[PDB]
Each structure stands twice: as C-alpha cells, then as structure tokens.
Write a protein that binds this ligand. Structure first.
Ligand SMILES: Cc1ncc(COP(=O)(O)O)c(CNc2ccc(CCCO)[nH]c2=O)c1O
Ligand SMILES: Cc1ncc(COP(=O)(O)O)c(CNc2ccc(CCCO)[nH]c2=O)c1O
Lengths: 412, 417
C-alpha cells in the first residue's frame, strides 16, 4: 500500500504521463459522476466533467457494469481468440452490427483506439490489393483531425510518417464550395487513394470543432463515385455522445469502415472495434493473403467484451436521446454567460459536449485550482475549456460543471 | 445470452479472428465457455470438455485462469475506482506497479510508460529512441536494426521490424542457436555502416516467439550491448513474451546479465486477465527526451495506466515473487524435457528444444491442423501448431501429471506428422 504522499513521490520519479516529460493530483476513488481527489492532504469530491476522456458515459462504479464484469470474471477471464470463440465476443459483435450504420456487418476487436485505426487502414489497403489495385495505398483526410499516436495513425493527424493527402479544415457551416474543392482534390489522387478517413461531425483532440453533417453526405457521394473507401473514426463520437447513437447518423450515411472505442466499455477496460461491410470482408478474404493480416494477443478479451455488452445494453435500455437532449440544453444554458467574456472567442455545444473557445492557450496552473475550488475536474487543452459529462449527470451537476467552466474562462 | 449454436452462427457471420477470413475458414472456431486453473472448458461435438491450456493463452496465463488472488485484486479495485484519466491525475495501482517493475527489471530502467498492448509498447519504445536522438541533435538516427526470425506486433511500425516472411529497416541474419563469435562480428560490421542512420537495435532476448520459437545463446545479447554502446545506438529488448520467469530467469536479459536502454513488457504482466503493457527506459533516455526541443514524450493513449489492469498486474507480479518461481520453472523445464524426449526419434522430427517453461518440437514439414487439432483434443489438450512447429508454454501451476498430458499430446502430433 501507499499513502497519497508516497504515490506522488513514486509518480514523480517513475511514471510517464500522457505527452509529458520526466504535478498530478492523487485520485483515490470514483463513484457515479464523482472522483475523490487528494488536495493539500485532504480528500475532496469533484465532478468528472471529462468523463475520464469520453469513456465513463454511465459514470464510475455503475452496479450493472460492475456486476457484468464480476459475473464474467467468475466463469472465464480470458482465452485466446485464435481457433476459439466465446459468448461475450458474439453477444457484443451482434449488438454492434445491429446498432451501427447500415451495412457494417463484421467486427474486429482490438485493445485501443489507435490500433483500431490501423486495422481500419489495413482493411482498406488489403481491400484494394484484393481488387488488384495495390496502387491505392494512400489516405486522405481534412485538417484538424486526430486519430491516435501510433505511427500510421499519426500520418493522418493534423500536420500542424507516411505522406497522406490533406484537404483544408472543414468549416462549421455548410459551404458547397468546400465539398466541390474536396472532390477536385480527391479526383486527382483517386488512383492513389485507398480511403478517406475522418471524424464525423465532431473533431476532438484536433480542437473540438463541429461541422455540418451535410459534409458527410457529400463525402459518401464523392467516395462512392471515385471508388475510394470511406472510413469514419467514431472512437470519440460513438454511443450517443453527439445527440445521435453514432455521429454518422446525423447525416444518415454509412461508411465502408468504422472505428469505435472509449464509451464502448463504459470506461472500465480498454477495448476498441473496427467494423467493415460484407463487401470489404469478402474481398479481403478472397484476396491473395486470404485473410485480414492482424491479430493482437488479447484480441476480443472476454472481460472487456462482457462489460461492453452491459454498457451498450444499459445505454439502449433507456431513453438515451432524451437524456442527451437534456444534457445539451443544460450545457447551452450554463455556458451562455461565457459568450460575453472578453477572452472568449466562441461557445458551442453538440449533444453532451460543451466548449468554450478562448483567445489564448489556457494556463493549467490557473485553470486547475479554479476548477478544483469549485468541485469540478476540468482538463483544458490548447485554448479550449470543455466538458463531456457522464450521461448520468443531474441538472444541478451540469450547472456546477458549466459554472466552473465559465469561471475558468473568466480567469483567462 | 446465447447457446453454443447461436454463438457459432454469430461468430461465422460477424466476427474476425486473428489473421483469418470471413466465410472461408477451413476450421470453425471452437466455443469456449469457461476457464479455471490450467484448464479450458470447450464445446466439442456439442459436449463440454475440459482441456489443458498448453499455450497459456499465448504466454499470458502464467498463474492459470481464475486464480483466487488475482480475481480478488481485481474485485477489490473495482469496488473503489474502476478508471480515471491519467492526464493530470495519478493513482495507487499505477504507482505500486511502476515501483514494482522498476525494482525487478534489469538495472537502470527507472521510468515506466503504460500502454494498452504489446504492439503499442513497441511503438512507444521506438518513439523514445527517435526522440532521444532528436534530443541529442542527431535526427538522422531514425532507422531500426534487428535480426531475422523476430516478431514485435502488428501495428505498422511494429511490423517493419518483424521477420519478413512499411518502413524499410535493417535486418541482420537469423541469429543461430549456439554461440558463434563470427555472427556477432558480422552484426557489428553491418551495424557499423548504418550507425549514423540507426536509432536503435531491437530484439527479443534469448527466445524468439511468434517468429518461429527459436532459442539463441544469451551471450549474443552481451555482444549486442557492447556493440550498441561503442557505436552509439540504443538497445531495446522486447520482453513481451519472455518476461516474468518464462525462460528460467525473471527477465530473459538476466540470462546475459545485461541491461537494455529501453524495454517492453506485457502479456504475463497482468496474469492474462486484461490487456496491459509497459515500456521502461533509463533515466538518461527520459532526461534527454525531456530536455529536448519537444520537451516531452509525444505519446499518450486515452486509457493509459488503467487502475483495474494495474491492480491485477500488481497481484500477479507479487504472487510470482512471493513463491520460489525459479524452482517451479526448473521443474517445468525438466517435465517438458522428459515428456518430449521420445519425439527426438520420430522420423519427421528435426529438433526438440526446451528453455525454461517452453517446449518445442520442430518437424521437417508443415503440421496439418486438421490432423493436429482432433489428435490433441482427444487427449484433452489445446495446442496451436504453426508452420513446422508443435509447441507449448504451459501455466506455471501445471502439475507433473498435466505436463505429462501436454507433452504426450505434442509427441502424438509429432508422430502423426
Ligand atoms: C477520434 C479518436 N481516434 C483515435 C484515438 C486514439 O485512441 P487511443 O489509442 O485509445 O488513445 C482517440 C483518442 N485520443 C484522444 C482523445 C482525446 C484527447 C483529448 C485530450 C488531449 O490532450 N486526446 C487524445 O489523444 C480519438 O479521440
Ligand atoms: C514479443 C512480442 N512483442 C510484441 C507483441 C505484440 O503485442 P500485442 O499487440 O499485445 O499482440 C507480441 C505479440 N505476440 C503474439 C501476438 C499474437 C498472437 C496470436 C494470438 C492468436 O490468438 N500470438 C503472440 O504470441 C510479441 O510476442
């Protein structure tokens, strides 16, 4: 065992944190929408406004998910997915194929979002090889995107590695001229392109930007006409977050390949999935390799699959759309006051996502204590103060979150 | 819920398996309904049967499945904190595991980067090496060098250093089993001409797993360490398969008594409960990266340092260290040697080799799966031959009788070949 002080000592000496060098606050518990943190030697309750980075949609320690995990743990923790299959994987695959955009009928489980993106790339590349067009090996996307930290995933992240094709930043408002320009650029690269890869509707890590769903309809059309596969990365947007079950649903379009993760497991365990159409699967399967050449050690882990099944079932068994609509209303109302702030450039809400865009990078040394002082855990990045609250947050808790966000913006 | 029939129907229509097809599988997956200790419960011809997990579910299940201590560690952490973001927050599980790993790994490795899988941990190791040299003002050192027969995962960068059989990396010849100073001299010569271009050498120490279950004299690792130091190239050991006692030492590097600059671990890390991997580096590497223009290691997965995965790993590592694991492995190695001995005389058998809790029969031809599967299943053993290899890496908890059962099944496969 270790005291909060010993943890800090070990952490400072031995632990790499995300995108950091070699001060973290000690977290000692999580329950519902609340974290227990240690501040100045004292335990404090704070709202998990970030849902622990998009994951904890049902909050922490939900009895349904806890029990799903303990139930599976009693019977089978893990077995290899080579030559074996199991109920959690089958139940989850069945669910995912049923709730995702039409045509997505096969499921490849992996351990993280970055890996699922590379699997999606593998699918697209092997697809065209299966069609006898191995020259189609590049990827195209628009600027402002983020798809993970592995080397292939890095290649399609906003440039500001494989050399990929980048269209200009997709605007918030629909402009037919943007779609026309996108098509013209894609046209001259078509013989080079395996796929277009984008985050539908919401671009997260690249700057929490929202774009009109109509752009997705245009992409589907362009890709269809120029024979380029369309890949949607819904790792952040999936499972109700943007007001629809999957962001693609706002445009009513189905991609050829789709990545999901994060909220998939309710934030309990690492799991991701890459789905593709029957056409893609068969073409790869009929190809020279005769198979999709990927398969991680812990593929389709029974424990992760079991808790994911329960998380998805919990989500579908309630009126999630109304819940999200209520959250969106709460965020909008709560953030409105920020608009008039001198350092605030924009305020925007999309489903259970709320963003205050500031005129300068937000200083964590100031924002963090300001948020903690108000009983809220916020993690600003670049010039953004934002939140993606758990779906179980009450109106009062959303108000607490938004008022903390506003006071952070005010300090900037 | 689903019946085994419904599971197979769903599986066939909607599930990708590792390196497999949809609709074109010669052999359908077998339904697994339970796992406890060294045994899996599988559905054969509709009958539930118990079979030995001879592969430890790919090196992972070192304490067997559903070990009471590990189950408890998981449920204990589940009651308090399932997960929190590792950005700006830290927690006891991560700290306890980091402290443990820093203490039991080869000397010098005192920083720990957690990731969600082996392939990712390898990519992190690569990033560390590349950023290290950028921090030294030598961005030209960006390629990797390895020897053939290796395997390091299936993300695109990981693939580039896997045995060809992508970034174009530098490949030295297959390292031989027995120590030949000539091999090391030639390795040095090849590396020497690429030095200004090389960020790191990356290899599996002592045992190459997925690349063909080959063993090599640990002295080669001593040579690599020396070569790397003299030519200013970092050394990366991928111990994702060899770690935590598997080869008869706590880490395979310990056989050679050398310390890499960077090291990857995974698999047995969590006792095979959940996916978790870690990349460790020296203080020098960490400091050089932190002092560079970038000012930080530019990597950070959403689910980094998951409390549940860390908690079960702490229990698994503590369980291993709290017992005489070295003697357990020695006993396993002896049981494997005794059990596989009779295969040495089989017509189609080219080699029989054992290293710690690893047993391999190498044939002179490819192993037909349609012959091997029912043969092993009939004998209550789950085996996964590939190419010309029939092999096992059983859980450390296997009794002498279970080892006899496993080896007897392997020999029969070798006989049928
Ligand atoms: C769309 C999409 N595709 C792929 C991934 C990667 O999957 P992973 O391999 O499991 O990490 C992510 C998740 N990565 C991030 C999400 C959110 C932030 C916000 C805070 C930045 O400081 N930063 C991230 O890096 C994703 O959102
Ligand atoms: C040394 C080493 N370094 C890195 C990795 C990659 O880490 P991952 O990303 O967690 O896979 C591995 C992976 N080992 C295997 C991977 C896949 C199967 C097939 C399983 C079929 O059910 N069997 C494996 O042994 C590895 O051995």
């Amino acid at each position: 065992g270790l005291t909060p002080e010993q943890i800090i000592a070990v952490d400072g000496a031995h632990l790499w944190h995300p995108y950091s060098s070699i001060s973290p606050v000690v977290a000692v518990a999580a329950h519902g929408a609340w974290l227990t943190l240690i501040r100045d030697g004292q335990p404090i309750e704070v709202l998990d406004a970030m849902s622990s980075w998009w994951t904890a949609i049902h909050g922490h320690g939900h009895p349904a998910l806890d029990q799903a995990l303990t139930t599976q743990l009693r019977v089978m923790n893990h077995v290899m997915f080579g030559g074996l299959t199991h109920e959690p994987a089958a139940r989850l695959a069945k669910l995912l194929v049923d709730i995702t955009p039409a045509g997505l009928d096969t499921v490849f489980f992996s351990d993280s979002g970055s890996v699922s993106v590379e699997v999606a790339a593998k699918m697209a590349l092997q697809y065209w090889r299966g069609r006898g067009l191995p020259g189609k090996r590049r990827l195209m996307t628009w600027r402002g995107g983020y798809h993970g930290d592995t080397f292939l995933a890095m290649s399609i992240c906003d440039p500001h590695l494989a050399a990929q094709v980048f269209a200009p930043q997709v605007p918030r408002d629909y402009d037919p001229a943007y779609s026309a320009a996108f098509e013209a650029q894609l046209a001259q690269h078509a013989g080079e392109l395996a796929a277009v890869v984008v985050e539908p509707v919401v671009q997260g890590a690249g700057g929490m930007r929202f774009h009109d769903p109509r752009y997705l309809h245009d992409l589907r059309d362009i890709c269809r006409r120029y024979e380029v596969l369309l890949i949607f990365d819904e790792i952040a947007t999936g499972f109700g977050r943007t007001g629809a079950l999957f962001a693609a649903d706002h445009a009513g379009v189905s991609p050829d390949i789709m990545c999901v993760g994060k909220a998939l497991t309710g934030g309990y365990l690492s799991l991701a999935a890459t789905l593709c159409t029957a056409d893609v699967a068969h073409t790869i399967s009929a190809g020279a390799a005769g198979a999709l050449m990927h398969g991680p050690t812990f593929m389709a882990n029974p424990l992760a699959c079991a808790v994911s099944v329960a998380s998805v079932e919990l989500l579908l068994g309630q009126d999630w759309r109304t819940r999200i609509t209520e959250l969106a209303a709460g965020l909008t109302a709560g953030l409105d006051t920020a608009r008039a702030l001198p350092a605030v450039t924009d305020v925007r809400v999309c489903g259970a996502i709320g963003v205050i865009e500031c005129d300068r990078p937000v200083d964590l040394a100031v924002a963090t204590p300001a948020a903690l002082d108000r009983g809220v855990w916020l993690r600003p990045f670049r010039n953004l103060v934002y939140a993606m609250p758990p779906y179980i947050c009450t109106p009062a808790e959303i108000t607490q979150i938004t008022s903390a966000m506003v006071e952070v913006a005010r300090l900037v």
